[PDB]
Amino acid sequence: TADISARDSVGNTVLHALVEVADNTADNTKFVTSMYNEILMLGAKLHPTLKLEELTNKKGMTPLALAAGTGKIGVLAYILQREIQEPECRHLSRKFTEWAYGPVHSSLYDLSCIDTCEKNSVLEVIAYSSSETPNRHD
Amino acid sequence: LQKSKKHLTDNEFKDPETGKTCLLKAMLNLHDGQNTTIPLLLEIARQTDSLKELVNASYTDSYYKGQTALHIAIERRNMALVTLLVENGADVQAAAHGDFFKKTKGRPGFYFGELPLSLAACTNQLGIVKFLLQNSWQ
């Protein structure tokens, strides 16, 4: 069986590598976000106590921060508005709903790794980005 | 509850700090549009005296003040439970006064007009509109 958790030479796990391969085009974004889901969902079926997204490569970067440091807005949009409806893969959701009375519904977005966190905040990695770093502004 | 009274004892078994009798609790935690305790909890109340004080009951808190169980069935889009409750009383003029149910307030909430007929009109339930005006009883 392959190792979901294994790393490459540069420390990038599979999910990091789904971020490196993204190129901000729709068909790639449609796909990578689909495939980002499935391994990320699969890693709750097998190895249910890991939290892949917390894994840091050689440069100390998570797949979320690496999507934000490298200009990957589609993957970033996916990871941040992520809502998974399956029961045993709900904890891997990130956009929740706390109530829905009629047309109104109150969503909750996690703020892990966005606010002034430990290693690399998504706001810092976006705000303090190098100038090339595509879609700094989006 | 047969062997004491069922009447005050249900009123003492209203969830404190909310006023939820067992009836309102049931439609909250539904499964595929039915709990299967809702028919039973009506059976406890029709045999043993004072059926009205279960259906006319509502939240006691100032924040859901007046939200009878009839309002619940209208939001959850259960045509049946609207039929079931109005048979057993369940006043169709119960004013959901609560702060959740008041004008915009700059806070979370849904204003529909405080009355169950206005809830159905503002919920896309036209069947429940025509029902509440010509049902058979009230």
Side-chain angles (χ1 to χ4, degrees):
Chain A
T1 61
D3 191 359
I4 51 94
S5 181
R7 295 180 182 277
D8 63 354
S9 296
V10 297
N12 286 321
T13 61
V14 61
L15 297 177
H16 294 89
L18 274 300
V19 177
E20 290 292 330
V21 70
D23 293 331
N24 299 117
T25 183
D27 292 324
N28 194 1
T29 301
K30 185 181 264 77
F31 174 73
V32 172
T33 57
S34 68
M35 187 64 73
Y36 182 86
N37 197 4
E38 294 289 328
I39 296 94
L40 191 278
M41 289 175 75
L42 191 150
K45 285 87 172 67
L46 296 172
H47 297 282
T49 61
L50 196 159
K51 294 181 179 180
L52 289 169
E53 294 179 351
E54 293 181 354
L55 294 174
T56 61
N57 59 5
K58 299 290 179 68
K59 300 294 186 291
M61 297 299 290
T62 59
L64 177 59
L66 184 63
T70 56
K72 268 60 185 296
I73 187 167
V75 179
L76 182 65
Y78 180 74
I79 297 165
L80 295 176
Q81 289 96 30
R82 188 175 68 235
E83 61 187 1
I84 297 168
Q85 295 83 16
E86 187 173 2
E88 68 275 19
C89 295
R90 183 179 179 271
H91 65 285
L92 298 166
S93 299
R94 192 178 172 285
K95 181 180 178 174
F96 295 97
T97 304
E98 176 164 3
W99 60 272
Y101 184 84
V104 182
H105 63 90
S106 182
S107 296
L108 294 175
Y109 295 91
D110 191 359
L111 298 175
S112 297
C113 301
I114 296 173
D115 197 77
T116 305
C117 69
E118 183 62 26
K119 183 65 173 66
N120 288 321
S121 296
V122 172
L123 297 172
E124 293 176 354
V125 174
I126 295 161
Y128 299 164
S129 295
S130 294
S131 300
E132 293 179 354
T133 58
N135 294 317
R136 296 181 67 246
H137 303 98
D138 294 329
Chain B
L1 296 173
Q2 190 281 128
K3 291 182 175 63
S4 65
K5 56 177 81 69
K6 186 266 288 178
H7 187 195
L8 193 156
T9 59
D10 283 334
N11 291 319
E12 194 271 330
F13 293 165
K14 291 187 289 187
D15 187 75
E17 291 93 6
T18 59
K20 292 187 285 185
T21 183
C22 294
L23 181 61
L24 279 73
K25 181 70 174 178
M27 285 75 75
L28 283 171
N29 189 1
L30 278 170
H31 295 89
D32 295 331
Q34 183 62 255
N35 192 359
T36 64
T37 62
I38 297 164
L40 191 154
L41 293 174
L42 295 171
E43 288 178 354
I44 296 167
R46 69 184 67 187
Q47 277 74 240
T48 55
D49 196 358
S50 299
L51 178 62
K52 293 184 264 73
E53 289 79 2
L54 184 65
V55 297
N56 193 3
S58 67
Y59 292 90
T60 303
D61 59 357
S62 296
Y63 185 72
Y64 294 106
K65 183 67 181 294
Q67 181 181 4
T68 60
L70 190 150
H71 294 88
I72 303 297
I74 296 172
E75 192 267 326
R76 275 73 181 169
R77 293 178 69 87
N78 205 156
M79 185 65 74
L81 296 171
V82 177
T83 60
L84 278 73
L85 278 171
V86 176
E87 288 175 353
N88 291 314
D91 185 72
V92 298
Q93 299 299 114
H97 296 285
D99 291 331
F100 182 79
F101 297 106
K102 291 182 184 180
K103 185 58 66 67
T104 183
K105 186 64 178 71
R107 290 183 181 176
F110 181 72
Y111 181 77
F112 63 88
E114 294 181 354
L115 279 73
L117 191 279
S118 301
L119 185 57
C122 299
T123 307
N124 191 358
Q125 295 169 354
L126 188 34
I128 293 171
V129 172
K130 294 185 262 72
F131 181 77
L132 293 171
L133 277 299
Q134 58 186 4
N135 47 8
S136 298
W137 295 269
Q138 185 177 1

